[PDB]
Amino acid sequence: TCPFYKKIPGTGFTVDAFQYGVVEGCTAYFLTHFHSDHYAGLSKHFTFPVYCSEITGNLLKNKLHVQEQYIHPLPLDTECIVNGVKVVLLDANHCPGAVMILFYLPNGTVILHTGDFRADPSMERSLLADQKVHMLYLDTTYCSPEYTFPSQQEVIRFAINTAFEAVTLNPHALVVCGTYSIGKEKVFLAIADVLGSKVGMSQEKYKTLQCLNIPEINSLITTDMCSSLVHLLPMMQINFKGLQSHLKKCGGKYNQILAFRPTGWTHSNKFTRIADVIPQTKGNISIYGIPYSEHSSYLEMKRFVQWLKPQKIIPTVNVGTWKSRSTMEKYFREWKLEAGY
Numbered sequence: 001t002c003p004f005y006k007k008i009p010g011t012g013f014t015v016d017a018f019q020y021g022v023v024e025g026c027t028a029y030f031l032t033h034f035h036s037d038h039y040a041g042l043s044k045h046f047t048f049p050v051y052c053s054e055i056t057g058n059l060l061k062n063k064l065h066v067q068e069q070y071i072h073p074l075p076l077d078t079e080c081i082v083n084g085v086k087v088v089l090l091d092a093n094h095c096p097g098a099v100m101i102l103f104y105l106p107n108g109t110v111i112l113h114t115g116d117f118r119a120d121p122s123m124e125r126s127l128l129a130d131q132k133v134h135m136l137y138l139d140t141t142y143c144s145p146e147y148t149f150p151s152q153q154e155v156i157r158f159a160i161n162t163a164f165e166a167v168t169l170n171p172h173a174l175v176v177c178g179t180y181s182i183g184k185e186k187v188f189l190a191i192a193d194v195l196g197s198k199v200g201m202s203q204e205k206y207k208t209l210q211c212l213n214i215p216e217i218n219s220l221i222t223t224d225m226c227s228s229l230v231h232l233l234p235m236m237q238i239n240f241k242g243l244q245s246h247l248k249k250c251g252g253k254y255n256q257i258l259a260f261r262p263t264g265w266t267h268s269n270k271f272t273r274i275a276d277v278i279p280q281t282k283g284n285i286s287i288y289g290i291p292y293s294e295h296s297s298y299l300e301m302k303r304f305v306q307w308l309k310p311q312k313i314i315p316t317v318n319v320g321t322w323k324s325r326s327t328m329e330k331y332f333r334e335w336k337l338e339a340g341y
């Protein structure tokens with residue numbers, strides 16, 4: 001059974017609710033982004049209307065084989081009527097194709113559903129500027145002040161400089177980058193651009209990237225592993241054993257691996273600066289964990305919400321424990337007393 005925080009009151013709509021069977025009263029199922037916790041339940045046998053971005057719809061058709069007749073892609077930043085209700089999709093600054101949804105209810109209430117997002121001051125000049133929001137359904141993944149991390153730009157600067165130094169010292173080093181979902185493509189694309197290489201990967205991952213509308217992508221990626229000195233591998237293989245095994249397969253072309261694991265936050269963020277990050281090393285293998293986030297830090301979240309000034313907040317993450325729920329409610333009240341709404 002579908003939880004309340006996935007239903008939009010006064011509509012026939014649900015958000016990210018495909019694992020509950022046929023939801024009573026649902027006339028349109030929205031999907032914010034193509035991550036498995038959110039699409040859980042979708043397949044070629046789905047026969048209800050799915051509303052989403054163009055990029056999410058390419059992934060639904062090619063990767064999950066959803067039939068074309070049920071995919072309803074909407075342009076961004078454009079007022080659209082769905083089943084008699086005005087909606088707008090906005091860029092969530094999460095993974096490719098990820099959106100927030102603005103619903104203009106027939107009674108006059110306005111609801112923002114963030115999906116998964118990384119709040120940014122650029123959102124203060126979207127179509128959100130133009131009117132008031134009564135209810136905010138908020139991605140609270142890192143809603144506590146311990147969760148700090150650098151800008152995506154500082155993290156990419158670190159990765160490019162680290163990879164370029166290593167491969168210039170040793171032209172026989174291979175760079176490997178972990179992945180287990182869409183998102184964080186800038187990591188491997190930026191490193192391959194500074195090295196003058198295409199990115200090599202499996203046919204399955206190549207197919208996924210081909211659905212993302214990235215400009216000039218045919219110039220940047222390949223399935224020919226032998227032609228590339230930046231390889232993608234599943235995140236589970238980014239360990240000394242899995243990397244040793246990979247290096248065997250490259251037929252003596254390389255004599256060193258430098259590998260990256262983009263994580264979210266880790267507790268080494270509570271002590272260390274990005275500049276000071278060091279790898280784990282075993283012999284001719286080194287592994288860097290880099291804190292590349294596609295979710296809001298605590299401070300970015302708090303700025304967005306203090307700007308938006310919603311009348312009510314409904315968290316969509318960390319809702320399963322009383323301790324988490326009580327923590328989140330305390331920060332919401334601080335924010336409101338500090339800003340005066």
Ligand code: NI
Binds near residue numbers: 033035094116
């Ligand atoms: Ni996500």
